[PDB]
Amino acid sequence: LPTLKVAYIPEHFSTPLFFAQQQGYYKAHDLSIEFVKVPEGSGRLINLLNSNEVDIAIGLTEAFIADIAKGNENIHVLDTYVKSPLLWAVSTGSNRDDVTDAKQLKRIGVSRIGSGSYVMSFVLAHQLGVPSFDQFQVLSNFKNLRDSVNLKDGVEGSDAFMWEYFTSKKYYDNHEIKQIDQIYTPWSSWVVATSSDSLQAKSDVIKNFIDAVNQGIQYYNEHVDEAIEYISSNLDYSAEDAKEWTKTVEFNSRIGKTPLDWDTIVVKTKDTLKLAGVLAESDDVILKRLNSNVKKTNLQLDGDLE
Ligand SMILES: [Ca+2]
Ligand SMILES: [Ca+2]
């Protein structure tokens, strides 16, 4: 089996991936996996797939679905990594008399254009009943986002930004920032994606990787105790906050055993984004693009007789 470069995001969600390596599940499947850490989200994950720097990427669902719907026929969504929805938290400065409610938002700080923090701002706007936001401050990283809403020097100011709850919880407790709203993703939060190159060149190995992840997920499920320790000792999460998170997340224990849920990964995602104004492409154009690049089956090895 050819070597496999897997791009991931160093968060609590990547826990199952770690234990799969710790317990040597990858090697057990005759695999040689080179993990590539991507601290700045799915945006770079897609770029890495486009440049063939990596074979597989584990990122947010909407990121890949939208990219495909926008005409990237070289991106393939293989399966679901996380079944439970992502909880987005809306934050603002510690002392902002001008910002107390979500409907008061005008300037929206985002890591990058097209990111989750950007896309979800539209979804939030639609649920609030207000028109989508048009003022965006590209701040690149999480810290800049916090400094921005606090109107700190060196960065452009913002009214609010959106970031994963448990990742932002630390800064609510030390009162650096202030939560004004939350919002779940209508869809499953994480998926496993690959490129057209890797899919036709390294299909058999990708399958084994998914199977290894399946075991990594089962181990996690049976060893939350160790998961809590790992997350709090290696990632920016307290043991208590890490524990709270474990009671909200549900990794796809059926990953590789059954096709992804079309309704939650594709239908809800496209219908929400389209309705929110994120996607301008027509429905049947989006459908046709997703029907070709979103798996409705599981990967399979060649039969003995070819
Ligand atoms: Ca195209
Ligand atoms: Ca290529």
Author numbering: 1 to 306
Which text from the study accompanies this structure?
We solved the 3-D structure of the Candida albicans CA3427 gene product, selected on the basis of its conservation among pathogenic fungi, and thus a potential target for new antifungal drugs. The structure of the protein unambiguously revealed a PBP fold, despite a low level of sequence similarity with previously known members of this family. CA3427 is an α/β protein with two domains organized into a C-clamp shape. The two domains delimit a large groove and are linked by a hinge region (residues 82–87 and 184–189).
Interestingly, two crystal forms were obtained which seem to correspond to a large conformational change induced by the binding of a small ligand at a specific site of the protein. The two crystal forms correspond to distinct conformations of the CA3427 protein with a root mean square deviation (RMSD) of 1.55 Å based on α-carbons superimposition of the overall structures. Most of the RMSD value results from a change in the relative position of the two domains rather than from local rearrangements. When the PEG/acetates molecules are present in the structure, the E11-Oε2 forms a hydrogen bond with Y237-OH (distance 2.7 Å). Upon pointing outwards from the binding pocket, it clears the space needed to accommodate the ligand. In the second structure, the above distance becomes 4.5 Å and the E11 side chain now points towards the inner part of the cavity. The R112 side chain points towards the inside of the groove in the unliganded structure and outwards in the liganded one. Finally, in the closed conformation (i.e. without PEG/acetates molecules), D236-Oδ1 (Domain I) and K170-Nζ (Domain II) are linked by a salt bridge (distance 3 Å) that is disrupted in the presence of ligand (distance 4.8 Å), thus opening the “Venus flytrap”. The conformational change of the CA3427 protein upon ligand binding illustrates the venus fly trap motion already documented in other PBP structures.
